[PDB]
Copies of this chain bind each other. A is one copy, B any other.
Amino acid sequence: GPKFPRVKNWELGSITYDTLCAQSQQDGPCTPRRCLGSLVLPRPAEQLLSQARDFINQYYSSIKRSGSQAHEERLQEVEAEVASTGTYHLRESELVFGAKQAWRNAPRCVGRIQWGKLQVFDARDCSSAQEMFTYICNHIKYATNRGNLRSAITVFPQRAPGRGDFRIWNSQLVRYAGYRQQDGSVRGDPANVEITELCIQHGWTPGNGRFDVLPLLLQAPDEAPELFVLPPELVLEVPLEHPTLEWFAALGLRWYALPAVSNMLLEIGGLEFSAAPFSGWYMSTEIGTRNLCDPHRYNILEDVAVCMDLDTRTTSSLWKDKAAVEINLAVLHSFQLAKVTIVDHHAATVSFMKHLDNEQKARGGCPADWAWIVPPISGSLTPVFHQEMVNYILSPAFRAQPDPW
């Protein structure tokens, strides 16, 4: 048949061919000799212009004015700007399209059915660390919306020739402190040990809890990062209880409402937005499975299993599986009681299948990273497990970038 990858769903027996992958401009890490799909992060005058031309072409196609006079004029105007300055600038509506397209292009995101519904805050006028804070607080207030969460991104000024970057040092806008103890263990979230210690080196007075919300370390160009404490009333958290296990509330577990990634680079048309935090709402497994049960995170499985009186001395009791399921259930139940938006892993994966069909019809495929899209409990119980996926890099894109220190 077609010379595009054939893609099969083994639950349903249905077949598609991905033609979209033909548009990839950027090589991933695989070769015919070996596949590196399971690695988390495997290792410009005329180069900018070709990325910019491509992006402008994407824009004009999206508004159905390809080949138009307005399209040709924008193209000239971009090359003139690069010509005289080395860079160029997006129109507002271009930025909005490019931000959404970056989300839509993100292979690791199961929540892409929502991609067209993204509030884009333009913060390209921002000129200080103090102003970044205001923009960030506004983002948090808008996005949180007292529990009825709204997807959003806030875009700060782009990288510029020989000027320092805007950066948010924290990986997320909300992070619990991780305090290294004398014995070598950690109180709080071990994922955050390094940022915690950077906050302390930069003048923060540390708490001693398991859920101390961290301050933000915000860096305006060519300045030391400045420290900003989020007013507590802005940071919506959800205490965790279980619907029938009454003792679960006594564990004092909690999580925050708003998942807002702040350390990734938004690339659009070769332009690099080094600070562009974005937020959605949580899939319940992120909290109840990874953040709470990973051995290298809060690691609470054994404690919960012991409370549930399970036999923790043997694997074949499936004590881990039982406790994990109850932890996820408590996450879902508590978020529901508190009226804070959340999506379980069944509803989310079902919606992603719908997204796949939509994208097949709209673009001829959808880049997806199977290992990231399949949830970390109950995998084959979700429809995405049975769905082959093709993974490739399209731009606009969100990318990892090196830590600023």
Residue of B nearest to A10 (CB): B40
User: Is A37 an interface residue, CB under 8 A from the partner?
Assistant: yes
Q: With a CB–CB cut-off of 8 A, which chain B residues contact A379?
A: 374-377, 379
Within the assembled complex, what's the spacing in Å between the Cα atoms of A336 and B33? Answer: 42
Q: Measured between alpha carbons, how far is A3 from B35 in the docked complex, in Å?
A: 12
Within 8 A of B (CB), among A31-67: 31-40, 42-43
Closest-CB distance, A28 to chain B (whole angstroms): 6
Interface residues of A in 1-51 (CB under 8 A from B): 3, 5-8, 10-12, 18, 21, 24, 27-40, 42-43
Interface residue? A352 (CB, 8 A): no
State which of B27, B33, B295 has its C-beta within 8 Å of the C-beta of A24: B33
What 1/0 flags go to A367-405 for Cβ under 8 Å of B? 100110011111111000110111110000000000000
Q: Does A301 contact B (CB under 8 A)?
A: yes
CB distance from A32 to the nearest CB of B (A): 4
Known: A36-B5, A39-B5, A377-B381. A11 touches B320 (CB 8 A): no
Neighbour of A36 across the interface among B42, B321, B332, B390, CB < 8 A? B390
Contact partner, A31, options B31, B39, B370, Cβ 8 Å: B31
Task: Check A315 against B347 for contact (C-beta < 8 Å).
Answer: yes
Indicate if A112 sits at the interface (CB-CB under 8 A).
no
Given contacts A11-B295, A30-B35, 8 further A-B contacts (CB under 8 A): A24-B33, A29-B32, A31-B31, A34-B367, A316-B346, A317-B329, A318-B325, A324-B381
- Chain A residues proximal to chain B, CB less than 8 Å: 3, 5-8, 10-12, 18, 21, 24, 27-40, 42-43, 284, 289-290, 293-296, 301, 315-318, 320-322, 324-325, 328-329, 332, 336, 344, 346-347, 350, 367, 370-371, 374-381, 385-386, 388-392
Query: Which 8 A-B pairs give the minimum distances between C-beta atoms?
Result: A376-B380, A30-B30, A315-B346, A27-B32, A37-B37, A38-B370, A34-B392, A35-B391
